[PDB]
Design an enzyme around this catalytic site. Structure first.
Site, PDB file in Angstrom:
ATOM      1  N   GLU A 370     -15.153  37.060 -40.488  1.00 21.87           N
ATOM      2  CA  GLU A 370     -14.492  37.303 -39.027  1.00 21.87           C
ATOM      3  C   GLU A 370     -14.229  38.871 -39.085  1.00 21.87           C
ATOM      4  O   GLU A 370     -14.487  39.495 -38.003  1.00 21.87           O
ATOM      5  CB  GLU A 370     -13.679  36.615 -38.722  1.00 21.87           C
ATOM      6  CG  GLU A 370     -13.158  36.619 -37.425  1.00 21.87           C
ATOM      7  CD  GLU A 370     -12.079  37.705 -36.890  1.00 21.87           C
ATOM      8  OE1 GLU A 370     -11.539  38.214 -37.935  1.00 21.87           O
ATOM      9  OE2 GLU A 370     -11.775  37.842 -35.794  1.00 21.87           O
ATOM     10  N   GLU A 379     -23.360  34.067 -36.510  1.00 23.87           N
ATOM     11  CA  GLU A 379     -24.757  33.701 -37.252  1.00 23.87           C
ATOM     12  C   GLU A 379     -24.872  31.993 -37.200  1.00 23.87           C
ATOM     13  O   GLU A 379     -26.101  31.761 -36.940  1.00 23.87           O
ATOM     14  CB  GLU A 379     -24.682  34.186 -38.750  1.00 23.87           C
ATOM     15  CG  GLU A 379     -24.780  35.743 -38.912  1.00 23.87           C
ATOM     16  CD  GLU A 379     -25.809  36.358 -38.133  1.00 23.87           C
ATOM     17  OE1 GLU A 379     -26.984  36.052 -38.210  1.00 23.87           O
ATOM     18  OE2 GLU A 379     -25.675  37.153 -37.289  1.00 23.87           O
ATOM     19  N   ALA A 481      -4.529  29.288 -28.668  1.00 20.97           N
ATOM     20  CA  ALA A 481      -3.040  29.251 -28.286  1.00 20.97           C
ATOM     21  C   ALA A 481      -2.423  29.616 -29.745  1.00 20.97           C
ATOM     22  O   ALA A 481      -2.800  29.394 -30.747  1.00 20.97           O
ATOM     23  CB  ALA A 481      -2.385  27.734 -27.924  1.00 20.97           C
ATOM     24  N   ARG A 482      -1.361  30.553 -29.833  1.00 23.16           N
ATOM     25  CA  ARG A 482      -0.585  30.923 -30.912  1.00 23.16           C
ATOM     26  C   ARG A 482       0.826  31.217 -30.438  1.00 23.16           C
ATOM     27  O   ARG A 482       0.927  31.581 -29.204  1.00 23.16           O
ATOM     28  CB  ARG A 482      -1.113  31.962 -31.468  1.00 23.16           C
ATOM     29  CG  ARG A 482      -1.218  33.337 -30.771  1.00 23.16           C
ATOM     30  CD  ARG A 482      -2.538  33.388 -29.553  1.00 23.16           C
ATOM     31  NE  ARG A 482      -3.286  34.651 -29.415  1.00 23.16           N
ATOM     32  CZ  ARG A 482      -3.605  34.621 -28.206  1.00 23.16           C
ATOM     33  NH1 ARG A 482      -3.646  33.515 -27.218  1.00 23.16           N
ATOM     34  NH2 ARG A 482      -4.206  35.627 -27.942  1.00 23.16           N
ATOM     35  N   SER A 567     -21.023  45.536   0.971  1.00 24.48           N
ATOM     36  CA  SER A 567     -20.386  44.511   1.552  1.00 24.48           C
ATOM     37  C   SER A 567     -20.060  43.389   0.259  1.00 24.48           C
ATOM     38  O   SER A 567     -20.903  43.182  -0.442  1.00 24.48           O
ATOM     39  CB  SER A 567     -21.067  43.409   2.642  1.00 24.48           C
ATOM     40  OG  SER A 567     -20.170  42.586   2.874  1.00 24.48           O
ATOM     41  N   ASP A 603     -21.255  15.403 -17.838  1.00 25.54           N
ATOM     42  CA  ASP A 603     -22.450  16.639 -18.048  1.00 25.54           C
ATOM     43  C   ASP A 603     -22.134  17.640 -16.808  1.00 25.54           C
ATOM     44  O   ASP A 603     -22.223  18.563 -17.304  1.00 25.54           O
ATOM     45  CB  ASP A 603     -23.648  16.129 -18.028  1.00 25.54           C
ATOM     46  CG  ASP A 603     -24.074  14.951 -19.160  1.00 25.54           C
ATOM     47  OD1 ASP A 603     -23.540  15.292 -20.184  1.00 25.54           O
ATOM     48  OD2 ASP A 603     -25.399  14.873 -19.186  1.00 25.54           O
ATOM     49  N   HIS A 626     -21.880  35.960 -19.701  1.00 26.66           N
ATOM     50  CA  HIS A 626     -20.751  35.256 -18.781  1.00 26.66           C
ATOM     51  C   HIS A 626     -20.588  36.281 -17.776  1.00 26.66           C
ATOM     52  O   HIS A 626     -20.295  37.538 -17.978  1.00 26.66           O
ATOM     53  CB  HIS A 626     -19.684  34.918 -19.448  1.00 26.66           C
ATOM     54  CG  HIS A 626     -18.902  33.912 -18.728  1.00 26.66           C
ATOM     55  ND1 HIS A 626     -18.313  33.838 -17.742  1.00 26.66           N
ATOM     56  CD2 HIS A 626     -18.512  32.348 -19.319  1.00 26.66           C
ATOM     57  CE1 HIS A 626     -17.659  32.836 -17.208  1.00 26.66           C
ATOM     58  NE2 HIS A 626     -17.848  31.939 -18.200  1.00 26.66           N
ATOM     59  N   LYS A 636     -12.250  46.055 -26.466  1.00 24.68           N
ATOM     60  CA  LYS A 636     -12.870  44.666 -26.880  1.00 24.68           C
ATOM     61  C   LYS A 636     -11.898  43.444 -26.660  1.00 24.68           C
ATOM     62  O   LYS A 636     -12.212  42.254 -26.512  1.00 24.68           O
ATOM     63  CB  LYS A 636     -13.306  44.721 -28.187  1.00 24.68           C
ATOM     64  CG  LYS A 636     -14.235  43.448 -28.446  1.00 24.68           C
ATOM     65  CD  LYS A 636     -14.794  43.854 -30.133  1.00 24.68           C
ATOM     66  CE  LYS A 636     -16.068  42.782 -30.149  1.00 24.68           C
ATOM     67  NZ  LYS A 636     -16.509  42.957 -31.698  1.00 24.68           N
TER      68      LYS A 636
HETATM   69  O1  LIG Z   1     -14.643  42.555 -35.048  1.00 28.31           O
HETATM   70  C1  LIG Z   1     -14.038  42.170 -34.070  1.00 28.31           C
HETATM   71  O2  LIG Z   1     -14.419  41.760 -32.967  1.00 28.31           O
HETATM   72  C2  LIG Z   1     -12.604  41.678 -34.556  1.00 28.31           C
HETATM   73  C3  LIG Z   1     -12.204  41.596 -35.876  1.00 28.31           C
HETATM   74  C4  LIG Z   1     -10.787  41.393 -35.944  1.00 28.31           C
HETATM   75  N1  LIG Z   1     -10.324  40.134 -35.596  1.00 28.31           N
HETATM   76  P1  LIG Z   1      -8.761  39.663 -36.011  1.00 28.31           P
HETATM   77  O3  LIG Z   1      -8.085  40.976 -36.508  1.00 28.31           O
HETATM   78  O4  LIG Z   1      -8.563  38.487 -36.950  1.00 28.31           O
HETATM   79  O5  LIG Z   1      -7.785  39.291 -34.835  1.00 28.31           O
HETATM   80  C5  LIG Z   1      -7.682  40.224 -33.778  1.00 28.31           C
HETATM   81  C6  LIG Z   1      -6.029  40.071 -32.999  1.00 28.31           C
HETATM   82  N2  LIG Z   1      -5.858  40.403 -31.628  1.00 28.31           N
HETATM   83  C7  LIG Z   1      -6.185  38.983 -30.755  1.00 28.31           C
HETATM   84  O6  LIG Z   1      -7.175  38.148 -31.104  1.00 28.31           O
HETATM   85  C8  LIG Z   1      -6.026  39.236 -29.271  1.00 28.31           C
HETATM   86  C9  LIG Z   1      -6.937  39.278 -28.315  1.00 28.31           C
HETATM   87  C10 LIG Z   1      -6.705  39.362 -26.990  1.00 28.31           C
HETATM   88  C11 LIG Z   1      -5.446  39.852 -26.572  1.00 28.31           C
HETATM   89  C12 LIG Z   1      -4.421  39.855 -27.527  1.00 28.31           C
HETATM   90  C13 LIG Z   1      -4.690  39.594 -29.131  1.00 28.31           C
HETATM   91  C14 LIG Z   1     -10.146  42.810 -35.611  1.00 28.31           C
HETATM   92  O7  LIG Z   1      -9.346  42.790 -34.471  1.00 28.31           O
HETATM   93  O8  LIG Z   1     -10.259  43.795 -36.540  1.00 28.31           O
HETATM   94 CA   LIG Z   2     -27.953  37.559 -36.546  1.00 28.26          CA
HETATM   95 CL   LIG Z   3      -6.711  31.986 -32.074  1.00 29.17          CL
HETATM   96 ZN   LIG Z   4      -7.815  36.856 -37.846  1.00 27.74          ZN
HETATM   97 ZN   LIG Z   5      -7.620  40.631 -38.361  1.00 29.78          ZN
END
Ligand SMILES: O=C(O)CC[C@H](NP(=O)(O)OCCNC(=O)c1ccccc1)C(=O)O
Ligand SMILES: [Ca+2]
Ligand SMILES: [Cl-]
Ligand SMILES: [Zn+2]
Ligand SMILES: [Zn+2]
Ligand SMILES: *[C@@H]1O[C@H](CO)[C@@H](O[C@@H]2O[C@H](CO)[C@@H](O[C@@H]3O[C@H](CO)[C@@H](O)[C@H](O[C@H]4O[C@H](CO)[C@@H](O)[C@H](O)[C@@H]4O)[C@@H]3O)[C@H](O)[C@H]2NC(C)=O)[C@H](O)[C@H]1NC(C)=O
Ligand SMILES: *[C@@H]1O[C@H](CO)[C@@H](O[C@@H]2O[C@H](CO)[C@@H](O[C@@H]3O[C@H](CO)[C@@H](O)[C@H](O[C@H]4O[C@H](CO)[C@@H](O)[C@H](O)[C@@H]4O)[C@@H]3O)[C@H](O)[C@H]2NC(C)=O)[C@H](O)[C@H]1NC(C)=O
Ligand SMILES: *[C@@H]1O[C@H](CO)[C@@H](O[C@@H]2O[C@H](CO)[C@@H](O[C@@H]3O[C@H](CO)[C@@H](O)[C@H](O)[C@@H]3O)[C@H](O)[C@H]2NC(C)=O)[C@H](O)[C@H]1NC(C)=O
Ligand SMILES: *[C@@H]1O[C@H](CO)[C@@H](O[C@@H]2O[C@H](CO)[C@@H](O[C@@H]3O[C@H](CO)[C@@H](O)[C@H](O)[C@@H]3O)[C@H](O)[C@H]2NC(C)=O)[C@H](O)[C@H]1NC(C)=O
Ligand SMILES: *[C@@H]1O[C@H](CO)[C@@H](O[C@@H]2O[C@H](CO)[C@@H](O)[C@H](O)[C@H]2NC(C)=O)[C@H](O)[C@H]1NC(C)=O
Ligand SMILES: *[C@@H]1O[C@H](CO)[C@@H](O[C@@H]2O[C@H](CO)[C@@H](O)[C@H](O)[C@H]2NC(C)=O)[C@H](O)[C@H]1NC(C)=O
Ligand SMILES: *[C@@H]1O[C@H](CO)[C@@H](O[C@@H]2O[C@H](CO)[C@@H](O)[C@H](O)[C@H]2NC(C)=O)[C@H](O)[C@H]1NC(C)=O
Ligand SMILES: *[C@@H]1O[C@H](CO)[C@@H](O[C@@H]2O[C@H](CO)[C@@H](O)[C@H](O)[C@H]2NC(C)=O)[C@H](O)[C@H]1NC(C)=O
Ligand SMILES: *[C@@H]1O[C@H](CO)[C@@H](O[C@@H]2O[C@H](CO)[C@@H](O)[C@H](O)[C@H]2NC(C)=O)[C@H](O)[C@H]1NC(C)=O
Ligand SMILES: *[C@@H]1O[C@H](CO)[C@@H](O[C@@H]2O[C@H](CO)[C@@H](O)[C@H](O)[C@H]2NC(C)=O)[C@H](O)[C@H]1NC(C)=O
Ligand SMILES: O=C(O)CC[C@H](NP(=O)(O)OCCNC(=O)c1ccccc1)C(=O)O
Ligand SMILES: *[C@@H]1O[C@H](CO)[C@@H](O)[C@H](O)[C@H]1NC(C)=O
Ligand SMILES: *[C@@H]1O[C@H](CO)[C@@H](O)[C@H](O)[C@H]1NC(C)=O
Ligand SMILES: *[C@@H]1O[C@H](CO)[C@@H](O)[C@H](O)[C@H]1NC(C)=O
Ligand SMILES: *[C@@H]1O[C@H](CO)[C@@H](O)[C@H](O)[C@H]1NC(C)=O
Ligand SMILES: [Ca+2]
Ligand SMILES: [Cl-]
Ligand SMILES: [Zn+2]
Ligand SMILES: [Zn+2]
Lengths: 687, 687
Positions: A370, A379, A481-482, A567, A603, A626, A636
């Site tokens: 991740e 993947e 949720a966290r 519009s 469904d 989406h 991001k």
């Molecule tokens: O490559 C990616 O898209 C993310 C990889 C990696 N994800 P990770 O560190 O495990 O989690 C990011 C923590 N922040 C969130 O999930 C978040 C998302 C939205 C609003 C507030 C917080 C990163 O941010 O470096």
């Molecule tokens: Ca791929």
């Molecule tokens: Cl989460």
């Molecule tokens: Zn993480």
């Molecule tokens: Zn991380």
């Protein structure tokens, strides 16, 4: 009885504590032997716990590592070429870990190699608006400069993209105590603050949902055809490296040139925060030199996939997934989440051993890589997209359970709002001062909805975590949720340990248990409720909010809307139709012994999130499909609503061909109105 | 009882005859008032017949018409600028129709305007291999020449694309009696041959599945955003016009330059078929001049959509669709098919009035603007893609019922082979000499399978008809059946009338009735069988055939396969896996009172065609998404198997960068192997 309460009561804070300790004694960096061994352990334990099948799904993806014998660092170099100051080669390890092997030194994953030398420009948080301020207002040119930026506010990949487009030849990222040192709290190991030698690791890709840089669209299996590195997705073009604030201070203190434009550019270090370029008079012939020698390397990664087969609808999947790879010990990120998933599997398994099965199939995932760009989840979803397309009910993420101890934080599709409200009203608050009160009560008090009285805030999903492929590419209803603060200082540093959590975040593991109840309870209801627990009317409410919002942005440009006949009438019409049709569908759902009508209606509920997918994707981002939500093109981590229209309107007053630019706004309005109407029509009577 | 036999017995040849007469008295050109009135009539009659709902679905799409006061024609022009020969302004009308209004004169729909003047080059059928022969072997350069090509062999849009890419400044299409005049048969009105003044209308677009040129991806509804004409999809860049063989003779007879390269370039006219460029000595200063003044015009079109709601699975759709618009009277194309659909609706409606309903929903469609590029079917499918994606069981097309009187012709997905074999064994042959025998027996005798003894030939679907969006874009199992010869001379000419059919093709309407039985019987079984009548094992058999075929093409280049390590091992492995999994699924299907297991299995059957869709599309053809079949890039009418690999290999020995070209072959092998394995996995146990 075997009901949700039986499931919830079986969850134990002490088990979550034991698992967290077990998962955080050594580093579990993606692609390393340690992380493969942990995968095997989890596979074995999930089998023991009672799952029907537990397999590893492996892929060979592009990862990035420093060179162990040629370390990354930054210098100030004088006129003669002498390096007079060097940044650190590693973070001082925490007490009792000073002999732990295989701690990856701080680096920015996927940085190219290079040794660029030049003058520094300080760019604040390197956000789009920071570069606008520099280039448009201050007339400061970043071309061929090394940019230094503070972490915070936006995903670090966006900073690097912005610096690259400004012409920078390198980027230095640092943690300012303004953003990473809470007043009145001690640095680690005596508190939860970031010490001056601490450094935030992290990838700097701009993948826009592609997954492995070398195989966009297809799983990185044994026979995959890989792009060459020059055609890979999302790699940065300039070297990048992260440093702590002791080292940043030495780089910033000599900065000259222009003053910061205002106080929002000043951090908390005892330096002027001059923008540059370059150093003040006496040091004007000194330069900054980066030395980056990291390599990108195709490397095997392993997801663990556990199945608990549904008794009645085994071809409907409710997925609980979260990652296992960590930058170092992963005390919070991700093992506080992984320990919670582990206890959830154990509790479901206890019920299964007593003869229970959920109505629908539950899939449990321990994702790999991740931290290198959502690679393992993406993947696997690429490999299984047809099964997920047609059978995926919902995805609940399970990364870090705690990033604070103040209140709950939920981000999810509107389809899950009612589910979350109802579930939290039945759970006990773990918060001090709320004993005997519901979690809904404490959460709503601490994090009030901006629009509704007596409701809690629930945010939009963006990206930056493993739900991205399921929600933004495939259109499967997703949530997370966290526990959170009123992200955290030790994020991605060697100091993020078991002790950090046990001593400073959650000594009793009660916040972890609450999060396990919320995530597990959501999975339980999604997998067991006869009628799927989605309320389409909640989507209607938000769609109107988002339409009001995007119209208000456009209305900043009345003359242009007049000139180009722009519009929003079609979008409001579609939203009105969605509201009407959703109301009628809700009536039938409430008013309909017929399992075919039920499943037909289930469904319609399941495919409603799916209907917001456009198979052509958003402009230049084919894996963000989406139409209502996408990760912000500037950040991001943040979700943006009606992203196609938003991006068409963004900075439009600066476009040289206003006719073409407003034409594209109108095109995006048509795509959005059509998609909303099409989704509404999936809820009409089927014939 | 209400069973298939009751449905079939209610169909009547005399009704089909009456409807055909009714549909062919005046022209029904797309976008004209006449064709809107016919739409309204069909809507009214389908309601009378007993359908639950019958609506018009309208769109505003780009159409093309000649200018009524500035006619299209071609000249031979002498040195002084005098036009010494002019092609005809219209076809002599047939007996009794010489006072019929609103007969569109021959033209090529979507030709741009122009008056190009130049030297002629004769290009045979203007196929890819004809241009290879001209440019590579004969060293003849078409750049800035007017090309004259005979109709036949491939879709006329491909001819125009090929001429454009060869640098032609105009294209003249003509009907050679070699291809359009059967020996020993009289010209219309005394036989079914094309007279010298007859001309084939038809569009010359290269839409590659886009639908309306101005709105690719989205329905052309009231608020649609339209591309500007310069960005429209598929329009030709050079003027094009069709002529008959009396006029062609006058254009070809003076041709000089090089002799035809061999006999396959010679038609049946009394001319040398010299390739050119230009005319022989005495006429060398004469030129050919085109005068094209047609206009493209956004115009309203109307589909009629009738619904017969399913009793048990109303959210599963079986679709019977065929077009209604014609170039002129549409005696064969499409009214011989439309009359059959009309009688099918009437028969289903008779059962419905007696209290019957099909198990699944049947949708009946009268599509508009097929002749201008499949526009009506494609816009409606774009509008309803999410419903069709998730609910579409099958699409049966219903264009021309007869193009001859010799035998049946079926083109369909392998999933319908068993259905078609079984149904035809239960129908009576209408053929002379086969009285008392089954249709399967007569068809198999007349059109033997090339691979299997005692089986009939069934072809691959390409395009050139309204199933395209359903099959190649959306992945809904599709099929078609019609009577054929051992296409036809009067195709798209004013002579294609009711009398042509009644006198020369099917005086008793028995072939029409047989086709109604096949199309109607297929719809009946698809909509009423408890288990969907698809045999996945038939796909396994063909996938191996196609893999053998594509490997054999590649193996023409052994050195390159060695040099670039080009292996088909993954594709054969996937096909082997598909075969194994399909066999096991068939066992469970046969071996499984449980409606959820049934519907779960029916969903696996329904989504199996869907699994061959790649959401990224084929290269540069984003609306052709099926990985096993696509319309040939050289001939829209023909289906190609493993098209992505086929096109990667095509003429590869001519590519200047063999490393890159073979890399792309390997990429397409990986995409195909992955898609076959992914489709196989949809048939595995679901959990
Ligand atoms: O490559 C990616 O898209 C993310 C990889 C990696 N994800 P990770 O560190 O495990 O989690 C990011 C923590 N922040 C969130 O999930 C978040 C998302 C939205 C609003 C507030 C917080 C990163 O941010 O470096
Ligand atoms: Ca791929
Ligand atoms: Cl989460
Ligand atoms: Zn993480
Ligand atoms: Zn991380
Ligand atoms: C929300 O749902 C409503 C249904 O409750 C749906 O209403 C539809 O709106 C369209 C577009 O406004 C209507 O389209 C009209 O249809 C008639 C035939 O029924 C045509 O004659 C109309 O065209 C004429 O008028 C136009 C506008 O002045 C001209 O541009 C044109 O050249 C013609 O002169 C027009 O196409 C449609 O009938 C209704 N359908 C109903 C009421 O059932 C609306 O579209 C939905 N919103 C969205 C965003 O989909
Ligand atoms: C058809 O179905 C079969 C299953 O019956 C399926 O077989 C799978 O094939 C893959 C690829 O050959 C196997 O992958 C291997 O998995 C093991 C772990 O289980 C790995 O150790 C292997 O990697 C090593 O060897 C490689 C090749 O020499 C090296 O390149 C690599 O670096 C490693 O040293 C390898 O990844 C997989 O185990 C089987 N699965 C089974 C038998 O269940 C096959 O893939 C299907 N066909 C298609 C086209 O999908
Ligand atoms: C969250 O909890 C609420 C409150 O319980 C749920 O709403 C309630 O849902 C029930 C069951 O559908 C509704 O009962 C119905 O009432 C009507 C009478 O109008 C009757 O026709 C039906 O037979 C049925 O008894 C009830 O009205 C409704 N209460 C509300 C909206 O206040 C809600 O569904 C839960 N959300 C989930 C499960 O996602
Ligand atoms: C086309 O017609 C053929 C011939 O009738 C159909 O094949 C037959 O299908 C039936 C029903 O599934 C099969 O019967 C089964 O036999 C096994 C015994 O092995 C038993 O376990 C089941 O309970 C059931 O009785 C029969 O074997 C099979 N005959 C064959 C393949 O020769 C076929 O399904 C039809 N195709 C369609 C409807 O698409
Ligand atoms: C984490 O817990 C696991 C599971 O209890 C431990 O792995 C077991 O260790 C024992 C003793 O070495 C072995 O006999 C078992 O085979 C292991 N079980 C597995 C892998 O499923 C592991 O020791 C713990 N790790 C730490 C750091 O405490
Ligand atoms: C990591 O850095 C090391 C150390 O500089 C590199 O090893 C050297 O590689 C060169 C060839 O390019 C040899 O001639 C030297 O003898 C090596 N030096 C030492 C000390 O071993 C190594 O290539 C780098 N690893 C990478 C790029 O993956
Ligand atoms: C910063 O690090 C560099 C690299 O280790 C040091 O520069 C080297 O010093 C050694 C020993 O004096 C020389 O032989 C090398 O040639 C130098 N390398 C380079 C690249 O210049 C430097 O002294 C360190 N600076 C400080 C202040 O510690
Ligand atoms: C085709 O058949 C239709 C349906 O019978 C005919 O339309 C009907 O004509 C009568 C007499 O003019 C009217 O009273 C009805 O209202 C019409 N019914 C409809 C439109 O549903 C039509 O005349 C026939 N056309 C030809 C050329 O024979
Ligand atoms: C069809 O052709 C006619 C006839 O040439 C065009 O009508 C002429 O248009 C011009 C303006 O461009 C007028 O000045 C002339 O008076 C018109 N002539 C006649 C005889 O009416 C007409 O524009 C064309 N229609 C199109 C292009 O749709
Ligand atoms: C072919 O058609 C053209 C157009 O009608 C004819 O040429 C015209 O002749 C008239 C009357 O003699 C002239 O006034 C026009 O100026 C001519 N138009 C052009 C474009 O040249 C021509 O005579 C016809 N040729 C034949 C053999 O019938
Ligand atoms: O634009 C298109 O794609 C096709 C429009 C139009 N279709 P239409 O004339 O109604 O039917 C084509 C007849 N031929 C076939 O359907 C066919 C297809 C495959 C093999 C043999 C015959 C045309 O061919 O001009
Ligand atoms: C920034 O610097 C370089 C000169 O080295 C120049 O090419 C570029 O155009 C400059 N941009 C601006 C906005 O001045
Ligand atoms: C836990 O909560 C207490 C009480 O508000 C607070 O003092 C402490 O800072 C919190 N710990 C963390 C890591 O936020
Ligand atoms: C064909 O003709 C033109 C000259 O008018 C030229 O530009 C083009 O390159 C020629 N092609 C060949 C293959 O000779
Ligand atoms: C109908 O069949 C007969 C007998 O084979 C044949 O002579 C005639 O040409 C056929 N008609 C057409 C239009 O093919
Ligand atoms: Ca369209
Ligand atoms: Cl057909
Ligand atoms: Zn047709
Ligand atoms: Zn046609």
């Amino acid at each position: 009885k075997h009901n949700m309460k039986a499931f919830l009561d079986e969850l134990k804070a002490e088990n979550i504590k034991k698992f967290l300790y077990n998962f955080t004694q050594i580093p579990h960096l993606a692609g390393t032997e340690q992380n493969f061994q942990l995968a095997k352990q989890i596979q074995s334990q999930w089998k023991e716990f009672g799952l029907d099948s537990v397999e590893l799904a492996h892929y060979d993806v592009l990862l990035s590592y420093p060179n162990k014998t040629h370390p990354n660092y930054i210098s100030i170099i004088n006129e003669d070429g002498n390096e007079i100051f060097n940044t650190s080669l590693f973070e001082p390890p925490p007490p009792g870990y000073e002999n732990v092997s295989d701690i990856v030194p701080p680096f920015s994953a996927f940085s190219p190699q290079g040794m660029p030398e030049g003058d520094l420009v300080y760019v604040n948080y390197a956000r789009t608006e920071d570069f606008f301020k520099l280039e448009r207002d201050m007339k400061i040119n970043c071309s061929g400069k090394i940019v230094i930026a503070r972490y915070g506010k936006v995903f670090r990949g966006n900073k690097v993209k912005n610096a690259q487009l400004a012409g920078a030849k390198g980027v230095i990222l640092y943690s300012d105590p303004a953003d990473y040192f809470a007043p009145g709290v001690k640095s680690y190991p005596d508190g939860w603050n970031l010490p001056g030698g601490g450094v935030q690791r992290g990838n700097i890709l701009n993948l826009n949902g592609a997954g492995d840089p070398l195989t966009p669209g297809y799983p990185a299996n044994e026979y995959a055809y890989r792009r060459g590195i020059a055609e890979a997705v999302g790699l940065p073009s300039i070297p990048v490296h992260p440093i702590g604030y002791y080292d940043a201070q030495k780089l910033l203190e000599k900065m000259g040139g222009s003053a910061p434009p205002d106080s929002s550019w000043r951090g908390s270090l005892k330096v002027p925060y001059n923008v540059g370029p370059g150093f003040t008079g006496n040091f004007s012939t000194q330069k900054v030199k980066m030395h980056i020698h990291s390599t990108n390397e195709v490397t095997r990664i392993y997801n663990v996939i556990g199945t608990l087969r549904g008794a009645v609808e085994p071809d409907r999947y409710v997925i609980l997934g979260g990652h296992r790879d960590s930058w170092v010990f992963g005390g919070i990120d991700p093992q506080s989440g992984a320990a919670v998933v582990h206890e959830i599997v154990r509790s479901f398994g206890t019920l299964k051993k007593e003869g229970w099965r959920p109505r629908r199939t539950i899939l449990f995932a321990s994702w790999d890589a991740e931290e290198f760009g959502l690679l393992g989840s993406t993947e696997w979803a690429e490999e299984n997209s047809r099964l997920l397309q047609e059978r995926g009910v919902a995805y609940i993420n399970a990364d870090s359970s705690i990033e604070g101890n103040y209140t709950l934080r939920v981000d999810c599709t509107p389809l899950m709002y009612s589910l979350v409200h109802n579930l939290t009203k039945e759970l006990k608050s773990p918060d001090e001062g709320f004993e005997g009160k519901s979690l809904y009560e404490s959460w709503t008090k601490k994090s009030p909805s901006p629009e509704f009285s007596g409701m809690p805030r629930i945010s939009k999903l963006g990206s930056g975590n493993d739900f991205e492929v399921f929600f933004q590419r495939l259109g499967i209803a997703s949530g997370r949720a966290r526990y959170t603060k009123n992200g955290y200082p030790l994020y991605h540093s060697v100091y993020e340990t078991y002790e950090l959590v046990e001593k400073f975040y959650d000594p009793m593991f009660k916040y972890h248990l609450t999060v396990a109840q919320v995530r597990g309870g959501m999975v339980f209801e999604l997998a067991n409720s006869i009628v799927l627990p989605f309320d389409c009317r909640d989507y209607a409410v938000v769609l109107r909010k988002y339409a009001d919002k995007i119209y208000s942005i456009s209305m900043k440009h009345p003359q242009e809307m007049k000139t180009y006949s722009v519009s929003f009438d079609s979008l409001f019409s579609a939203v009105k139709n969605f509201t009407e049709i959703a109301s009628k569908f809700s009536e039938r759902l409430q008013d309909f012994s017929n399992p075919i009508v039920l499943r037909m209606m289930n469904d319609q509920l399941m495919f409603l999130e799916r209907a917001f997918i456009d198979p052509l994707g958003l402009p230049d981002r084919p894996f963000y499909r989406h139409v209502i939500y996408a990760p912000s093109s500037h950040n991001k981590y943040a979700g943006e609503s009606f992203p196609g229209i938003y991006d068409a309107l963004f900075d439009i007053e600066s476009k040289v061909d206003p006719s073409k630019a407003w034409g594209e706004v109108k095109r995006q309005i048509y795509v959005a109105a059509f998609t909303v109407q099409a989704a509404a029509e999936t809820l009409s009577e089927v014939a």
